[PDB]
Design a protein around this ligand. Sequence first.
Ligand SMILES: Nc1ncnc2c1ncn2[C@@H]1O[C@H](COP(=O)(O)OP(=O)(O)OP(O)(O)=S)[C@@H](O)[C@H]1O
Ligand SMILES: Nc1ncnc2c1ncn2[C@@H]1O[C@H](COP(=O)(O)OP(=O)(O)OP(O)(O)=S)[C@@H](O)[C@H]1O
Ligand SMILES: [Mg+2]
Lengths: 581, 11
Amino acid sequence: TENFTTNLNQLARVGGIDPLIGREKELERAIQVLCRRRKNNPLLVGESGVGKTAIAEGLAWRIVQGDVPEVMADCTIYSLDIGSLLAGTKYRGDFEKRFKALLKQLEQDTNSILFIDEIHTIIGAGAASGGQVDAANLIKPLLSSGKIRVIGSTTYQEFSNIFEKDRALARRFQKIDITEPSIEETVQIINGLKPKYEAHHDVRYTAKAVRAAVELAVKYINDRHLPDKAIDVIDEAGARARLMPVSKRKKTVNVADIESVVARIARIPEKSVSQSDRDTLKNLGDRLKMLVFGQDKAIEALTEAIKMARAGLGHEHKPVGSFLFAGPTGVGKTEVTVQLSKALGIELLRFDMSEYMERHTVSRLIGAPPGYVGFDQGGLLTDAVIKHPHAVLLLDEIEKAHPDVFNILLQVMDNGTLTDNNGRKADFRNVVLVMTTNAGVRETERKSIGLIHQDNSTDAMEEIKKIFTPEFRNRLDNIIWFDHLSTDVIHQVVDKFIVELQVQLDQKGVSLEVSQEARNWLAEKGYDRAMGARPMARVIQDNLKKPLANELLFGSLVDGGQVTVALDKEKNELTYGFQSA
Amino acid sequence: EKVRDALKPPS
Ligand SMILES: Nc1ncnc2c1ncn2[C@@H]1O[C@H](COP(=O)(O)OP(=O)(O)OP(O)(O)=S)[C@@H](O)[C@H]1O
Ligand SMILES: Nc1ncnc2c1ncn2[C@@H]1O[C@H](COP(=O)(O)OP(=O)(O)OP(O)(O)=S)[C@@H](O)[C@H]1O
Ligand SMILES: [Mg+2]
């Protein structure tokens, strides 16, 4: 049976098993259970990555070192590979004969312990062809007698769904809970393991690098547990050195490299922003101001919030920024958000909230429809952010959506984490949240019944209070009220559409030239404060795009030629020169 | 549906 089992004592004495630092309380309890007259079978139940197998294997390391009670000295721990027990047990009784042979060896010596990792796998392993004589049944009687000692290791999920179902087997095993360690005791673990990782990668770690790897991983890496969540960084940090040139910092790894690794694992922007990002960040306001005019206050809020986060002054657990964009039509509420994603080169998560008006549709954001038997038990909002943690989240026309959606965002803005029905948590700490609403648009469009016209901007705010609950509005960073487009910015808006037209025309091979007088004429005809910038596109479409379209298709522009537009003051009508070729 | 099968040789 030497093939099926492995002697941890022998393996630990020569190569090493990644020694167990601390965990004195757990080992004392385990040894207490192992010294029991009967049912002396400890079970190390804990979350993944909490050192369940380091305690059982570490116990062997302590025995050879001698740091154990005299009762434990001279004991040999054997690890069971169930894959080898069931290797060639095709014929009836091969497994039972093979398995029982192993038990006789343990009972005969009476000073040997058996370690079964993933112990939940002995509940249905090679029992029979539609029979109930399983390995668990074969070990059960021996366990109660106390002739042999068996150490188990299994996750909470497996222990309850599988191991707990067999009440008889669970009775024999004494559940020893294992808890995730704290920050302080965790750094001691890495320090003790560090010599094994340093030699493997031929690197050295600083005192501050280890402290940072632990603290940073806890902050950003939320889908793992601390003992291993902090060793992935350490292990991955050393590997980076090997890939780099022999002359490029191979000897040691500093705190700067550690934060780089965490950023890649969590797909979040790394600290110590490069000068490249700074140039884009400083110019972020100016770049946005070249595509959206008259809304400098909104752009400042978005850019400043991003700067605070990168600088390190961002919210501890809240998102980068939560905003509500309320304003008249065509004022750039959605355009600024769409262009923000392009300026930052990050994914845009645009959710149209007019499709979530129904209450049942809100469960899709954080779950699946009731009674869905398939595999896609995920939420569109939770999975989107999980796939793109660093992104811009746009909830267009959120006021249309059911009030339940607001309640779903309370934890998104106050705590930064939204949990799916399955129980996985998403991170919104780097996702810029921008909401857009047209509340009070009718109030602004209508005119007050009075000698003096009234600014209905305040009426929209009162509507915002009625629609949104106070808790939801308090969490928001700020409620930006977009303002109507003035005649001055409209001239800039017309220039924006004209360049967009030129880009479309460039593919066709035709170049458009518009005189300044013509551009002003377009603005006056299409200017509508109430309707914003959208009428400007329509006037340009009716006046400029229409003549060009007929010519491009029906003649004088099939082949690329220059175009010139001018205004006739006498006729107060535009003119065009097609000038083919 | 997937069930293991244990065989036996004739002799
Ligand atoms: N002293 C230590 N304390 C805790 N974890 C350690 C220690 N030394 C190493 N480790 C790491 O912890 C891992 C063991 O994590 P455990 O929680 O015991 O889970 P496991 O044995 O891998 O089984 P699963 O995956 O949880 S079913 C090792 O493989 C190392 O990566
Ligand atoms: N301030 C602005 N500067 C430049 N273009 C703008 C501006 N506001 C609107 N536009 C243009 O107008 C069109 C619609 O812009 P949007 O940002 O969708 O308007 P909006 O007011 O947010 O829309 P709703 O329907 O009221 S939510 C696009 O062609 C935009 O480029
Ligand atoms: Mg819009």
